[PDB]
Structures are given as C-alpha cells and as structure tokens.
Design a protein around this ligand. Structure first.
Ligand SMILES: [Ca+2]
Ligand SMILES: [Ca+2]
Ligand SMILES: [Ca+2]
Ligand SMILES: [Ca+2]
Ligand SMILES: [Ca+2]
Ligand SMILES: [Ca+2]
Length: 136
C-alpha cells in the first residue's frame, strides 16, 4: 500500500489529481486502515472542487485517526468553501481542541463567524489568531 500511496503523492504534488485518486484507491484496496490514503484522497477531491466527496473521505480518515487535527480542519474547510459556515465552525472547534495553538484554525473560525455576520465573535477569534501569529 505504501508504494501506491507514494506514487499517488508524487502525482498530487505535480497537480495530477485524477492520477493521484487512481493510486490512492489502489493503496486503499491493499490497506483499508490507511488514514493517510483516505485523507489524501479527500484532498485530491477538494482540489477538484468536489467537496461532497472530500467530506466522505475525511470522515473515513477521522474514523481511523480521530486525533487528526488536520482532517478536522480540512473537513471544516470543505464546508466553508461551500458556504456552510455553521458546519465549518463545529469542525474548526474540534481541530482547536486537539491543537489550541493553530493560528490557522483560530483565523478560519473567525472567518466563519464573519461570514455568518457575527462580527463580535469574528473579532474574538481573529484577536486569538493574531496573539499566536501577528505577521499576516
Ligand atoms: Ca453531490
Ligand atoms: Ca452537495
Ligand atoms: Ca461525483
Ligand atoms: Ca493527531
Ligand atoms: Ca454544496
Ligand atoms: Ca448550515
């Protein structure tokens, strides 16, 4: 499974998402417990704009590695990109429980409240992000 996975990765890194998907599927045939292959299959679908499918695969990754702050954050992002800001909030909160020093997750939580039109909550979360990383 690991060799098919790394071939998929090489195709992903050169922007060839169709090929990445084919080789992650082959990895998952050989090892259905690869949280990494489910996650990167999600990412490949995310890059194609296929957020519905990205969410399915991130959920499978999180069944195997529920302590994946990465999968929780990208699951949030897949809802954010669809305009599903209240769903994004739930998954960003889960990412931040696992990694409370993620400036990214605090910032995107603030963005989700901003998009909901809750500016006072956006301010609170942006202030927390900027406390962690004041350079953006
Ligand atoms: Ca659909
Ligand atoms: Ca849909
Ligand atoms: Ca489809
Ligand atoms: Ca983890
Ligand atoms: Ca949608
Ligand atoms: Ca909603």
């Amino acid at each position: 499974a690991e060799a098919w996975y790394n071939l998929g990765n090489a195709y992903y890194k050169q922007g060839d998402y169709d090929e990445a998907i084919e080789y992650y599927q082959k990895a998952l045939e050989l090892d259905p417990r690869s949280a990494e292959a489910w996650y990167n299959l999600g990412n490949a679908y995310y890059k194609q704009g296929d957020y519905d499918e990205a969410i399915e695969y991130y959920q499978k990754a999180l069944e195997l590695d529920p302590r994946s702050a990465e999968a929780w954050y990208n699951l949030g992002n897949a809802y954010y990109k669809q305009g599903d800001y209240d769903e994004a909030i739930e998954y960003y909160q889960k990412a931040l429980e696992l990694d409370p020093r993620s400036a990214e997750a605090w910032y995107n939580l603030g963005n989700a409240y901003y998009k909901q039109g809750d500016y006072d909550e956006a301010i609170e979360y942006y202030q927390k992000a900027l406390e962690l990383d004041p350079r953006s």
